[PDB]
Design a protein around this ligand. Structure first.
Ligand SMILES: [Br-]
Lengths: 138, 139, 138, 138
């Protein structure tokens, strides 16, 4: 039901990494990735982009050459997602702020101008027959 | 009166957390939380995501290993609540962009057109009576 | 001409503070605030919130208990300002791909509506006054 | 064809700035910019605004005091590129959310309307035919 459908997606990605992270790194880098719990904190820190490279990544990468893949990808994917959650919320927000409240009126104020054009049609009708009973009663 | 309603909600949070902040940490991190004033600053520094974990929190969490709840919550609560302000500004923004004007310029373009359908209408009734009478007068 | 009104504000706020701190601080922290061009950079990293407090502002605050004002003022100010270039460009963007084209397509679908409406008006006058004549002979 | 147009500029801006940087900074800062990969990673780092001044730029400026040009230009270019991609996504986001329909639901509503106005242009012409024959059949 909306943003919440990627709010969950974020949560999935995050966990999956926090596990991947505990699974490769927990050994040599336990302050960061020893427990699953460990890795989550460390990830949410990486997410905030607070000291991610110089603090967490770079030191981990000198332990494992390939390890950038894991940090870079996480940051990429994770940010792409957080970006959407944000736009999604923007949208959803002004969708209330304005478009709900207005698509309401542009419909209803145009209901009136339907009825108005109707009344006039019925009038033109009734008249159009009065005039053609003069053309009969003659 | 609008967003400044939510900018209150923020100043409240900040206070709740700087008090819970000094009441909690000033013995051990006197530099960061040693006073109320002090504890604000650090909360603003943390709020800006500047060194929040490696610099302030992770030293603190050595001290009280539960205090991540203090920091994580405060980043979420604090961040979510700033996002409402960045939204409601994007909004009050577009009010004055567009909505205000195009919104009153569609009330009006309707009025002029409604008033036209009303004149349009009068004459139809008018015509009717003229016909009504031509009809009676010669039955 | 619009967005680049705040852009000029931003650059000016910059100058006031660059000067401000090259005066305030230049003697005591000459590596950051020594020269004006010095402070221009320093206030740039700060604008990007990079190590502003742990590596710059806290260092200076120990010198000058009050300088905190200087930093937190700037962050606050130079943010709202940038936020408005984002907002400025966002709006003037949407205006560009959508609003412009619609505020005018709907102005024009109403010209047409009016004109059709106008024609119906003359048709009723002539009709109203055919009947006028016709009733006076009768 | 839209965004991944932009998302290639970003891609190329990176490429350029990464060679320029390896050529410029390899011998002096070999961990950061020693090879080309080095310098890409190091840029992604700088791009995320992570530590980019205290940990990278400022030490480099120590060695090449003009180097700030490299880093400040890079931040600006890359982050403005990034802003477009964001904006262009937020727009095509709004298009699909809303403008797609409100701009084609109004096409339809004012279709319907022209139809009714045309309906009665009809009977008002018809009734001018009647009242017309009324005058001739005198
Ligand atoms: Br009408």
């Amino acid at each position: 039901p909306g943003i919440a459908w990627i709010a969950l997606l974020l949560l999935v990605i995050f966990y999956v990494f926090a596990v991947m992270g505990t699974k490769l790194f927990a050994q040599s880098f336990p302050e960061w990735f020893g427990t699953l719990g460990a890795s989550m904190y460390t990830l949410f820190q990486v997410m905030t982009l607070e000291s991610w490279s110089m603090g967490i990544a770079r030191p981990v990468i000198e332990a494992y050459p390939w390890a950038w893949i894991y940090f870079v990808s996480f940051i990429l994917v994770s940010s792409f997602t957080v970006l959407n959650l944000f736009i999604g919320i923007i949208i959803e927000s002004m969708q209330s702020a304005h478009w709900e409240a207005e698509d309401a009126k542009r419909i209803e104020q145009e209901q009136r101008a339907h009825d108005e054009r109707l009344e006039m049609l019925q009038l033109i009708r009734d008249l159009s027959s009065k005039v053609d009973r003069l053309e009969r009663r003659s």
